[PDB]
Write a protein that binds this DNA or RNA. Structure first.
Ligand SMILES: [Mg+2]
Ligand SMILES: [Mg+2]
Ligand SMILES: [Mg+2]
Ligand SMILES: [Mg+2]
Ligand SMILES: [Mg+2]
Ligand SMILES: [Mg+2]
Ligand SMILES: [Mg+2]
Ligand SMILES: [Mg+2]
Ligand SMILES: [Mg+2]
Ligand SMILES: [Mg+2]
Ligand SMILES: [Mg+2]
Ligand SMILES: [Mg+2]
Ligand SMILES: [Mg+2]
Ligand SMILES: [Mg+2]
Ligand SMILES: [Mg+2]
Ligand SMILES: [Mg+2]
Ligand SMILES: [Mg+2]
Lengths: 102, 46, 93, 89, 63
RNA sequence: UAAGGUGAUAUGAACCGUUAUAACCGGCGAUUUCCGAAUGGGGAAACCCAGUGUGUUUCGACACACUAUCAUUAACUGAAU
RNA sequence: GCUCGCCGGAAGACCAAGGGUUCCUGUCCAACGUUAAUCGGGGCAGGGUGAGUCGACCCCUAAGGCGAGGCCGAAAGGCGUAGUCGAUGGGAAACAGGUUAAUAUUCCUGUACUUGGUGUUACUGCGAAGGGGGGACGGAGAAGGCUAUGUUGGCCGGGCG
RNA sequence: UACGGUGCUGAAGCAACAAAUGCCCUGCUUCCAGGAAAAGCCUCUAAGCAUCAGGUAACAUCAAAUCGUACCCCAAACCG
């Protein structure tokens, strides 16, 4: 299965937001994720009257790699790796290092 | 002056077409080679 | 009957296109993209049943696909059939 | 209380061209308002709305990609909805 | 929508069968082509529904 | 097996799914136009035309199935004799 | 648009063969155009080919091709009967006018015709993959009769330079 | 008329002379080098059917599918 997935809260490990937490918006089958308030790129978008868009520079979040994030433990308050155990026939994720099921 | 190619589809098909090609052991080997070569037009037909 | 109700999926789209279509509306008849294997009589039936209108006679023609675009290779469109249908009198749709 | 004898029509355009949307009502004397997917913009330099009442005609020019929605007109009690998509070059 | 009609009677099914075409499919094409049909995905199913319809009935009778 | 999916260029539209009938992978099925050994006859491959059977609370014409050749075996037929 | 000049048994007009959207309309001028290009048989988009009667398919065969069996050949194959294919020839039938930006003997108006199925009503020996007839045919030459077609007058409308 | 065109209306519409390489003529005359085939069509009957079925006519009606049909075609669209 997939370790980092859709509605999760995670903390960044590497590059320019290094240490910035945020929630995963979506997760792209390139092996990337879009996480809110983490990577911001100022796209230049033309104003459109039909769509009632003001135009000019807008701010959005680019896709970072899945390996550049790890999910935030919040019981230790640090980054933590994820494993998969079976509980009652459910393949659940669990935090390593305190072994807690998510 | 009158040059060598004087087009005519009836003759074309009758002389080089699929069925004509098919009507002779060697004509068939013609196709076989072209198939093995992976040719996109076995024999320029309709 | 003669044509199964299933096979009266021959009507494929109206060809409301060009004054050709509409100016030949304003003087009887409607025109339509219609199947490919459709048999005039076979397509009259469709227009009787569905559309529930009257139909005097139907003419057909085949449109040939324009081939276009591309650099080295080339792309061609599909052929398709035209309707031109001519309704009897109490003309509606 | 009137209706829409003639609904709109989905049309395509290559950003820059000009889209067209027509719609006839039943009673003259009125003033509706067109709106993309559902946004009431405002006839400006990129919007050409010319209606004489008894009739309503729209004329959008170089339509952007956003216009990718439907043209739903609104008037008294009538309501139309065509399809419009803005394709790039 | 499968076993929902694995048990729906050979004769009975030929009904929805037509009802997929007789109604949805023909009306949808016409309505669509004519620039109405704003929800295109209806064309995907219906077609896919008829496929199911014909998968049974074929597997129920004779096969 | 699963939290994400509706192949690629390829965005977009309209959707579908999240604890099990979303998608994806494997096993076995189903459907499988036309041409091509092509095999009902023909033919300038992807087309023309049939015989016979079936098929119609709108039982006409069209649709479908079958009909190549050779060999072996059987059965029935059967010349000059 | 007004002059000027050129073809007029063509340098006009309709096709077959061959091409295969070059047709028509909007739009663009980078590349293509031996220059410019607002224009194009060039780019992009949309439109446009309507038939019982024209033609193919179809029936019929020529040359010739293929060819169940068959005769022949080291194998491959060759030739050929019954057949079956093959038009460059035979075979039923629509004309004058109008209309589209773009088709029209196909669409529309007027006026027709061909062959089968079925029915009614009369009247009657019907009946072949068979017999016979026909279809069915050369070159040159000679006029007569006639139409297309032309010229003039009359007629009609307009002109008084 | 949006100056490309587009509508509307509408006279006479006869005679004489000339006249083809076209038609009559797949004729006619003549000559030697002696001038496709098969079907459609007409007729004849065999097996076969004899009240039937078929055949002939008048009128009525129904069927005639499918595929081609744009444009160039002594040429800037075909072979060069
Ligand atoms: Mg046609
Ligand atoms: Mg065959
Ligand atoms: Mg065969
Ligand atoms: Mg071109
Ligand atoms: Mg042009
Ligand atoms: Mg230049
Ligand atoms: Mg062009
Ligand atoms: Mg023959
Ligand atoms: Mg042999
Ligand atoms: Mg031979
Ligand atoms: Mg011929
Ligand atoms: Mg023309
Ligand atoms: Mg009778
Ligand atoms: Mg004879
Ligand atoms: Mg005369
Ligand atoms: Mg004077
Ligand atoms: Mg023409």
């Amino acid at each position: 299965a997939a370790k980092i997935r859709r509605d999760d809260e995670v903390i960044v490990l590497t590059g320019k937001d290094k240490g910035k937490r945020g929630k995963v918006k979506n997760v792209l089958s390139s092996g990337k994720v879009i996480v809110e308030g983490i990577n911001l790129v100022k796209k230049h978008q033309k104003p459109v009257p039909a769509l009632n868009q003001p135009g000019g520079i807008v701010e959005k979040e680019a896709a970072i790699q899945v390996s550049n994030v790890a999910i935030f433990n919040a019981a230790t308050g640090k980054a933590d790796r994820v494993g998969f155990r079976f509980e009652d026939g459910k393949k659940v994720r669990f935090f390593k290092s305190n072994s807690e099921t998510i | 002056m009158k040059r060598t190619f004087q087009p005519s589809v009836l003759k074309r098909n009758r002389s080089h077409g699929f069925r004509a090609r098919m009507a002779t052991k060697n004509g068939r080997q013609v196709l076989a080679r072209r198939r093995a070569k992976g040719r996109a037009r076995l024999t320029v037909s309709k | 009957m003669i044509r199964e109700e299933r096979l009266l999926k021959v009507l494929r789209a109206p060809h409301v296109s060009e004054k050709a279509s509409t100016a030949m509306e304003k003087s009887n008849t409607i025109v339509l993209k219609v199947a490919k294997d459709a048999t005039k009589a076979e397509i009259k039936a469709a227009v009787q049943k569905l559309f529930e209108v009257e139909v005097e006679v139907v003419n057909t023609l085949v449109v040939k696909g324009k081939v276009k675009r591309h650099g080295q290779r080339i792309g061609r469109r599909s052929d398709w059939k035209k309707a031109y249908v001519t309704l009897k009198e109490g003309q509606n749709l | 209380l009137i209706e829409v004898e003639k609904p709109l029509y989905g049309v395509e355009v290559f950003v820059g061209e000009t889209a067209h949307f027509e719609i006839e009502l039943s009673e003259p004397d009125v003033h509706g308002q067109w709106k993309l997917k559902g946004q009431p913009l405002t006839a400006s330099p990129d919007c050409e709305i010319i209606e004489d009442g008894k009739k309503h005609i729209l004329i959008l020019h170089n339509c952007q990609l956003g216009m990718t929605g439907e043209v739903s007109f609104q008037a008294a009690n009538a309501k139309s909805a065509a399809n419009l998509k803005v394709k790039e070059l | 929508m499968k076993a929902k009609e694995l048990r729906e009677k050979s004769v009975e099914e030929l009904n929805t069968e037509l009802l997929n075409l007789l109604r949805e499919q023909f009306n949808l094409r016409m309505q669509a082509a004519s620039g109405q049909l704003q929800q295109s995905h209806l064309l995907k199913q219906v077609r896919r529904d008829v496929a199911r319809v014909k998968t049974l009935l074929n597997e129920k009778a004779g096969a």
